[PDB]
Design a protein around this nucleic acid. Structure first.
Ligand SMILES: Nc1ncnc2c1ncn2[C@@H]1O[C@H](COP(=O)(O)OP(=O)(O)OP(=O)(O)O)[C@@H](O)[C@H]1O
Ligand SMILES: [K+]
Ligand SMILES: [K+]
Ligand SMILES: [K+]
Ligand SMILES: [Mg+2]
Ligand SMILES: [Mg+2]
Ligand SMILES: [Mg+2]
Ligand SMILES: [Mg+2]
Ligand SMILES: [Mg+2]
Ligand SMILES: [Mg+2]
Ligand SMILES: [Mg+2]
Ligand SMILES: [Mg+2]
Ligand SMILES: [Mg+2]
Ligand SMILES: [Mg+2]
Ligand SMILES: [Mg+2]
Ligand SMILES: [Mg+2]
Ligand SMILES: [Mg+2]
Ligand SMILES: [Mg+2]
Lengths: 97, 112, 174, 81, 35, 134, 156, 164, 105, 53, 118
RNA sequence: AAAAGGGAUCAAGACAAGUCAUCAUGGCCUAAAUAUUGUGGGCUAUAGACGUGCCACAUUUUCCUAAACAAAGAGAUGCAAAAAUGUGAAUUUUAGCUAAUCUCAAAAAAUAGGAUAAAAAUAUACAAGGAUUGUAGUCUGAAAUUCGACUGCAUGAAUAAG
């Protein structure tokens, strides 16, 4: 789960650009965003078998690849963390004051 | 034209078509038992073919007014034929205005 | 000439034939993660007949699991991949049935009964316990796993000369 | 009549068969829903298309069809000139 | 004796007895019911 | 029903009947704005058990004479009888003629009524006119 | 499945009875006593309540054998105006015994729950008060439902 | 108007007791139960139907097989649950004509049921027009009687030993 | 501990184990499943609707025997009567709230 | 289990006992027009006639 | 294998092969398999050589792709010769079954022709 | 029980907002016609283009099997049971009820099993989909051709989530 969220302020960065500012998100908003990513990866995989356990086993295999650190959501997490780290100075920006 | 009463008997809102739909309800009332014997002989597959063909030709010669499908309910206050309520013989509108004033018994504005 | 908008038009190895069907039918009769239950005893040739075992769980012999697995005794719906060693429960009906099957072969008699019940009441796995008591006592087990493969028109069939019967060669061979 | 069990739709027509060699004028009719019976195969009709009467010569291929199917009521829509 | 049909309408007696309960809750006056 | 000895049971509140109509507020294009109407029919049920047949008819006669405006009443009367209805309904012809001796004065007509024509047909079509058509 | 008309078609496009299949005609004989196994044995036929069509003939027969064994003078009988019966099925199930399975006793359920708990699949204190809660949620001891409530849950 | 109705209930209602007659239960010969509907001074086309319902076992002149043949002829008019044949008639313009017909139609059913020509013993009684209802009742074994209180304490004492 | 819902058992009436637990939750929260026999009769509603109704029913009945369990049942969620009810369809709306496509142009 | 010819003898005894049409072959006798009740008189009296003014 | 000139792959249902011929559907095909005792779920590879030849001789008599299109194309051609309203629609490539022509007549213009595919 | 919810209601004024085609009404026009009646036709036409809807593009879907749980409303201008017939629409024949009684009437998703896969792109493996059209029928009604709603058989278009 990412520890921050990005929300921009309409027209405060430059000539028609928004000032992106990172914000922290609570627990419920942290797990939700994480599990929604897992389903995204699952819905893009191809089908492997038949029966009722098709979707259930496609989600569980992603929950095992996340604990093993070999999942595609890890690249999706660190990608949002970089934006915050890069925009950590916008908190005290002069356009918000 | 031949079925239009020479003396007006309608007591409700009179109209060109209200006077024309009233002449059809009376012409069908007189020929309904006769028109139901031609539809029975046409559908009775036990009678000879010629018997059913003669009734089929005579039903086609009946005047249009005698046909029951020509009858269409009309508002007794406005004379329209579109959006008539069978329970009140009025349009959806005339029903509303009268219901609010209190002229239609029992009808009340519904909230729930 | 039409001038509306029209969307313009624009990966992995496929599974082998029969791979998908074999996925929703494989039976997992073991789970390493599960703990080895201490005191779990194995069955014996005359262990499904004793009534003092009613209400106790016993593990199936490893040699019987090779036979029950050969004639498709286990099923996907049944959950065996949750424990380590396939084990059954000696029910009060098992001892009721086994004693009849044990006395039938004793005097060459034949018992003919129809196991009946409501939804998941143990009906099938009681046949798996009747086959287990057969293998362990030197019997000949001829089992038809699914009776719907013979009537749903899914296997080859051919008639017999001068007879109303019909044979099923492909199924009889397998 | 659509349903076959109650015969076809027949309308009173002045279909009087003439003596051989006589000249009979075409039948003017507005009954555009009259099933073309076999008994008048070969007569000349003039079906009313709402405004005019279009001549028609019944043949053995029209038996069962309606007289109104051989006289268009509208005109073919043609863009431009 | 009695009719078999006259007996089939007597047995259908599952009526609830009038309880004559005692009110323990205070009751307000009713509204003004217009004509 | 108490003075007549008829044990009444009720009033039993029956399920009220609700009709509904949704009509546009305007007599024209403005259909996006409608409103709901209804006509709720409130009813009751008074059941009389072990009531004498004739006595019940007095109870019903008394209620029609003193009927309260705005109420529609419908009654179903149950009566027991022996076998051979044909005979019973024939023996009681003279008994009814004695009770109507002093009631024939209500109806009066000219000799050989010619406006009625077929009596049985007159009743049939004159009952439709009063009822309203059916 | 084998107590009804099969889904097969003969050359004249007429459904073949499930008892006409050679392999199914051999079992129905041993079940009805026609074929006498000399060396003895057992002929067991188990029903199923998942993906199986209803056959009044089979159900009626089972209900008839349970009544006769139970010492009842009023045994169920055919519905004279029902046309979903099969004479063949009655002859096969005319002299077969019946085994009616129901929920396991409270004692057996305990021995089956301690095995699920000793294996780490049931993290609960298995006592009488707890053996009665699974015995009640599972329709008075239905083993299959006792599994959906303790092993196939989303709490473990 | 409330006074006009209080004046009736204080002075005119008491006089209704001078013409009332006590109810007498029907004898063994009164086997029919006719029903007539009134609309209290209103013309409704449904005020001409006459319903009649009798029980076959009330006719003590018919035999066993004759009573069962009367139920097969009734058809859908027979209620197997209550064992009552109910039939109506609204064919004629007047109520008196609809009751006379049912008074004669029932005499033909009893005359046809006595016909020894065909007893219809081969035909089994058909009850497919009726839908039988199932009524569930509180189990009699769950009632907490004095004998069950002892049976429960013994079960609760056996559970403690097992755990202990 | 023998529960009968409308004549059938808990497993024959409710196919969803989620409903079986909520139906007898009062006995489960207070740990009295093996001390009471419940014979309920339900009418109307769906699967969960009836199960939740049985919850409040057994709760009130259980309090009659042991009125001191209300503080616990209060915290178990077996005393409140959920008044949530399907909203009505309103004229001009496709549903209680859903409105048709609003064309700006 | 009951022959069809033996069942029609009971269906025929009811038609005589109630005077109803007996059509075991489902022939189109057009009786559906005879059982249909007339609605003419109900339609004619739709518009209130001229009354005292 | 070969069935009346056309070649089919092994992993193809015989039921679906007989249904690929114009004029043959579920009813006709279902009656052809039963004639030669071929279970509906039989794939092409399993058919023996003898039975395959029988199917060819069985379809040779049926009214199939070319013999069936003729009947449909003759029915449509007769409507244009007589001069029926239904005939002109095929010639003009317009809806033939009383459909609102204000919008959504794409398939009509595309497929309605005197020389229909079938 | 309770931290309740929804409906109706929502002013004046403005938009010379809509309606003189509900009705009503002033002025101005038609009065052998701008009035009245019937037959048939049209309002259903179709290059291009704009609005709302339905539905589909298979792997949480669809298909097959089975012994669960609703509410509300309708039937005197009628709802129609159970039977018998047809693959089906439906027909034949009317038991009851004009109704908390009888009838429409059956809930579906769901729950639990089962079948199908290189489930469209390797052309001898063309998926799902149901448009278009041929043909034989049924129901309502003088009447189904322009121009109706359904049913059987065959035909099998676009459509890779925009
Ligand atoms: N005696 C037992 N010991 C252990 N597990 C059992 C026992 N009996 C039944 N089970 C389990 O119960 C579940 C269902 O059993 P089973 O598959 O035999 O049902 P069934 O009678 O065949 O039902 P159906 O009517 O659907 O065919 C399985 O998970 C099974 O392991
Ligand atoms: K809803
Ligand atoms: K305002
Ligand atoms: K304006
Ligand atoms: Mg099984
Ligand atoms: Mg468009
Ligand atoms: Mg307010
Ligand atoms: Mg505007
Ligand atoms: Mg004007
Ligand atoms: Mg239009
Ligand atoms: Mg589909
Ligand atoms: Mg029916
Ligand atoms: Mg309906
Ligand atoms: Mg499923
Ligand atoms: Mg795909
Ligand atoms: Mg396809
Ligand atoms: Mg058409
Ligand atoms: Mg989209």
């Amino acid at each position: 789960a990412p520890l921050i969220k990005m929300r921009g302020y309409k027209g405060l960065a430059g000539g028609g650009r928004s000032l992106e500012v990172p914000q922290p998100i609570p627990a419920r908003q942290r797990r939700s965003t994480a599990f929604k990513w897992i389903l995204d990866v699952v819905n893009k995989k191809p089908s492997k078998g038949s029966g009722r356990t098709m979707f259930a086993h496609r989600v569980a295999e992603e929950i095992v690849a996340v604990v093993e650190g070999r999942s595609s959501v890890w690249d999706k997490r660190m990608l949002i963390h970089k934006l915050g780290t890069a925009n950590r100075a916008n908190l005290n920006s002069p356009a918000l004051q | 034209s031949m079925f239009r009463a020479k003396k007006l008997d309608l007591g409700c809102f009179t109209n060109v078509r209200v006077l024309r739909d009233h002449s059809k309800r009376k012409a069908f009332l007189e020929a309904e038992p006769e028109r139901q014997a031609l539809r029975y002989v046409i559908r009775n597959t036990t009678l000879p073919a010629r018997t059913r063909a003669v009734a089929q030709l005579q039903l086609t010669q009946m005047h249009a007014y005698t046909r029951p499908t020509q009858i269409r309910n009309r508002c007794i206050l406005g004379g329209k034929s579109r959006g008539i309520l069978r329970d009140f013989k009025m349009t959806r509108y005339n029903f509303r205005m009268n219901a609010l004033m209190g002229n239609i018994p029992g009808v009340k504005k519904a909230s729930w | 000439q039409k001038l509306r908008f029209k969307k313009t038009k624009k990966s992995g190895k496929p599974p082998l034939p029969g791979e998908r069907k074999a996925y929703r039918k494989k039976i997992v009769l073991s789970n390493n993660n599960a703990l080895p239950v201490p005191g779990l005893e194995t069955l014996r040739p005359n262990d499904l007949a004793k009534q003092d075992n009613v209400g106790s769980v016993k593990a199936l012999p490893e040699d019987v699991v090779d036979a029950l697995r050969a004639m498709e005794a286990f099923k996907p719906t049944q959950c065996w991949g949750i424990f380590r060693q396939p084990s059954v429960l000696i029910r009060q009906e098992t001892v009721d049935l086994t004693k009849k099957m044990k006395a039938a072969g004793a005097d060459g008699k034949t018992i003919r009964m129809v196991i009946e019940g409501n939804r998941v009441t143990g009906k099938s796995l009681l046949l798996l316990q009747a086959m287990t008591h057969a293998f362990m006592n030197d019997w000949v087990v001829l089992h038809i796993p699914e009776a719907q493969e013979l009537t749903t028109a899914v296997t080859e069939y051919a008639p017999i000369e001068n007879s109303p019967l019909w044979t099923q060669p492909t199924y009889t061979l397998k | 009549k659509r349903s076959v069990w109650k015969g076809p739709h027949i309308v009173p027509l002045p279909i009087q068969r003439p003596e051989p060699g006589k000249k009979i004028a075409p039948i003017r009719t507005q009954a555009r829903s009259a099933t073309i019976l076999p008994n008048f195969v070969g007569l000349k009709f003039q079906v009313h298309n709402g405004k005019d009467y279009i001549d028609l010569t019944v043949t053995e291929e029209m038996v069962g069809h309606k007289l109104g199917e051989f006289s268009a009521t509208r005109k073919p829509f043609i863009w431009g000139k | 004796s009695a009719s078999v049909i006259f007996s089939k309408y007597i047995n259908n007696n599952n009526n609830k007895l009038i309880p004559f309960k005692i009110k323990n809750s205070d009751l307000g006056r009713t509204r003004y019911f217009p004509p | 029903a108490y003075y007549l000895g008829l044990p009444a049971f009720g009033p039993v509140p029956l399920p009220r009947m609700i009709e509904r109509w949704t009509v546009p507020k305007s007599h024209f294009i403005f259909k996006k704005s409608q409103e709901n109407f209804e006509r709720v029919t409130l009813r009751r049920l008074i059941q009389i058990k072990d009531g004498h047949p004739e006595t019940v008819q007095l109870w019903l006669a008394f209620l029609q004479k003193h009927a309260y405006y705005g109420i529609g009443m419908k009654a179903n009367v149950w009566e027991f009888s022996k076998l051979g209805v044909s005979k019973a309904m024939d023996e009681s012809k003279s008994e009814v003629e004695k009770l109507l001796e002093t009631r024939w004065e209500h109806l009066s007509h000219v000799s050989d009524m010619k406006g009625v024509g077929n009596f049985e047909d007159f009743l049939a079509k004159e009952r439709l006119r009063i009822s309203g058509g059916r | 499945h084998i107590m009804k008309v099969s889904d097969y078609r003969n050359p004249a496009f007429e459904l073949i009875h499930s008892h006409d299949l050679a392999l199914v005609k051999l079992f129905t004989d041993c079940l009805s006593g026609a074929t006498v196994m000399p060396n003895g044995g057992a002929v067991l036929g188990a029903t199923t309540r998942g993906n199986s069509p209803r056959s009044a003939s089979m159900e009626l027969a089972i209900a008839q054998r349970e009544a006769e064994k139970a010492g009842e003078k009023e045994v169920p009988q055919r519905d004279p105006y029902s046309k979903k019966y099969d004479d063949r099925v009655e002859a096969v199930m005319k002299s077969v015994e019946i085994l009616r399975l129901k929920g396991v006793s409270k004692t057996e359920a305990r021995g089956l729950l301690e095995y699920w708990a000793a294996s780490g699949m049931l993290k609960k204190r298995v006592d009488e008060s707890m053996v009665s809660e699974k015995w009640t949620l599972s329709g008075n001891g239905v083993v299959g439902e006792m599994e959906r409530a303790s092993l196939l849950t989303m709490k473990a | 108007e409330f006074r006009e109705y209080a004046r009736i209930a204080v002075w005119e209602m008491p006089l209704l007791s001078k013409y009332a007659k006590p109810f007498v239960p029907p004898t063994s010969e009164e086997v029919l139960r006719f029903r007539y509907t009134t609309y209290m001074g209103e013309f409704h086309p449904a005020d001409r139907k006459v319903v009649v319902e009798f029980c076959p076992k009330d006719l003590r002149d018919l035999s066993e097989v004759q009573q069962r043949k009367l139920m097969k002829l009734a058809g859908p008019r027979y209620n197997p649950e209550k064992d009552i044949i109910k039939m109506s008639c609204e064919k004629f313009e007047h109520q008196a004509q609809n009751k006379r017909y049912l008074g004669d139609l029932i005499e033909k059913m009893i005359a046809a049921a006595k016909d020894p020509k065909d007893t219809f013993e081969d035909i089994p009684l058909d009850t497919r027009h009726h839908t039988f209802t199932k009524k569930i009742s509180f189990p009699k074994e769950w009632l907490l009687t004095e004998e069950r209180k002892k049976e429960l304490e013994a079960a609760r004492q056996q559970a403690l030993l097992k755990d202990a | 501990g023998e529960v009968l819902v409308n004549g059938k058992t808990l497993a024959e009436y409710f196919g969803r184990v989620h409903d079986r637990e909520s139906a007898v939750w009062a006995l489960r929260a207070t740990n009295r499943i093996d001390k009471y026999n419940v014979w309920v009769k339900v009418e109307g509603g769906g699967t969960t609707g009836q199960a939740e109704a049985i919850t409040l029913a057994i709760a009130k009945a259980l309090l009659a025997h042991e009125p001191a369990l209300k503080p616990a049942l209060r915290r178990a969620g077996c005393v409140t009567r959920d008044p949530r009810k399907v909203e009505r369809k309103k004229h001009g709306h496709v549903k209680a709230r859903k409105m048709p496509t609003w064309v700006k142009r | 289990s009951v022959p069809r010819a033996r069942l029609l003898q009971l269906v025929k005894a009811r038609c005589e006992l109630f005077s109803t049409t007996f059509n075991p072959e489902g022939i189109r006798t057009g009786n559906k027009i005879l059982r249909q009740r007339l609605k003419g008189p109900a339609l004619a009296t739709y518009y209130p006639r001229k009354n005292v003014g | 294998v070969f069935i009346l000139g056309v070649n089919f792959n092994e992993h193809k249902l015989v039921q679906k092969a007989l249904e690929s011929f114009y004029g043959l559907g579920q009813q006709a095909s279902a009656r052809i398999l039963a004639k030669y005792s071929i279970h509906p779920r039989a794939k092409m590879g399993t058919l023996p050589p003898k039975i395959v030849t029988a199917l060819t001789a069985e379809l040779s008599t049926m009214t199939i792709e070319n013999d069936a299109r003729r009947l449909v194309l003759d029915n449509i051609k007769r409507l244009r010769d007589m001069g029926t309203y239904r005939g002109r629609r095929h010639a003009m490539g317009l809806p033939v079954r009383g459909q609102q022509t204000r919008n959504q007549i794409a398939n009509a213009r595309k497929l309605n022709k005197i020389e229909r595919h079938g």
